[PDB]
Structures are given as structure tokens and as C-alpha cells.
Amino acid sequence: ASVQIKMGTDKYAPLYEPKALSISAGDTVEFVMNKVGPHNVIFDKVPAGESAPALSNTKLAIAPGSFYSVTLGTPGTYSFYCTPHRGAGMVGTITVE
Ligand SMILES: [Cu+]
């Protein structure tokens, strides 16, 4: 089902929430900015099927509200991270079963 990726916790902690995310081939994964911005989508790498090193948008959306959404299909576990909040420990995952 349609899911969303929140960047930042109510604990002023810059982390991807939910830390883990699962979906099916054909589902969508939204992305909104919680706090401790800015943020952005900087995937780590995905298995054959998709293009992790492509979807990565360096369009640091300063304006808080809701970055954008994107649909997937390629089955497997996708990994990403926050370009800025890289050391802060802001990484997550996305499954497309
Ligand atoms: Cu972040």
C-alpha cells in the first residue's frame, strides 16, 4: 500500500522514519520532511531492476511540507541515506515484495 518516508523524528532527531519500509512491486513511497532539515533523497544502491543511483534527488527541499512521491516495481530491498544527516545516522530501507 501507499507509504511515506518521514525525515526526522519528534525528538529533533534527523532520521528516516519509518527506519524500515516494506511495499510491493507497483506500490509508492512518499517522502515528507519532519524537521532538522533540510533533507533530500540520496539512495545508497539497489539490485538489478531499479536505478537507486538515479532517483537520488539533490534538490534539498528547504520548504518543509512534503518533498515528493515515487512509484517502484523492481523487487528487492532498497537502501538510502541523508546526504547531510549522514553522520547523524539517518538511513532507512525500502522493500518491494
Ligand atoms: Cu535528513
Write the layout of secondary structure elements.
Layout: E1 3-9, E2 13-17, E3 20-23, E4 28-33, E5 42-45, H1 52-55, E6 68-71, E7 77-81, E8 91-96
Parallel strand pairs: 1-4, 3-8
Antiparallel strand pairs: 1-2, 4-6, 5-7, 7-8
The structure holds copper (I) ion (CU1).
Copper (I) ion (CU1) binds next to loops.
Binding site for Cu cation: 39, 82, 85, 90
Cofactor: Cu(2+)
GO cellular component, one term: plasma membrane-derived thylakoid membrane
Radius of gyration: 12 Å
Discrete helix count: 1
Q: Could you describe the largest sheet, including whether it forms a barrel?
A: 4 strands, mixed
Bound molecules: copper (I) ion
How would you write the strand order of the largest sheet? 2-1-4-6
Please give the CATH architecture. Answer: Sandwich
Secondary-structure element series: EEEEEHEEE
Proportion of beta-strand residues? 35-45%
Structural class: mainly beta
Structurally, the number of domains stands at: 1
Shape: globular
Number of strands: 8
Considering the protein shown, what is the CATH homologous superfamily? Answer: Cupredoxins -  blue copper proteins
Classified by CATH, the class is: Mainly Beta
Query: Helix content range of the residues, please?
Result: under 10%
Provide the CATH topology.
Immunoglobulin-like
**Whole-Å distance between the termini?**
11 Å
Could you explain how this protein is built, in words?
- There is one protein chain.
- Strands 2-1-4-6 form a four-stranded mixed β-sheet, with no helix packed on it. Strands 3-8-7-5 form a four-stranded mixed β-sheet.
- The chain contains one helix and eight strands.
- It is 4% helix and 42% strand.
- The chain binds copper (I) ion.
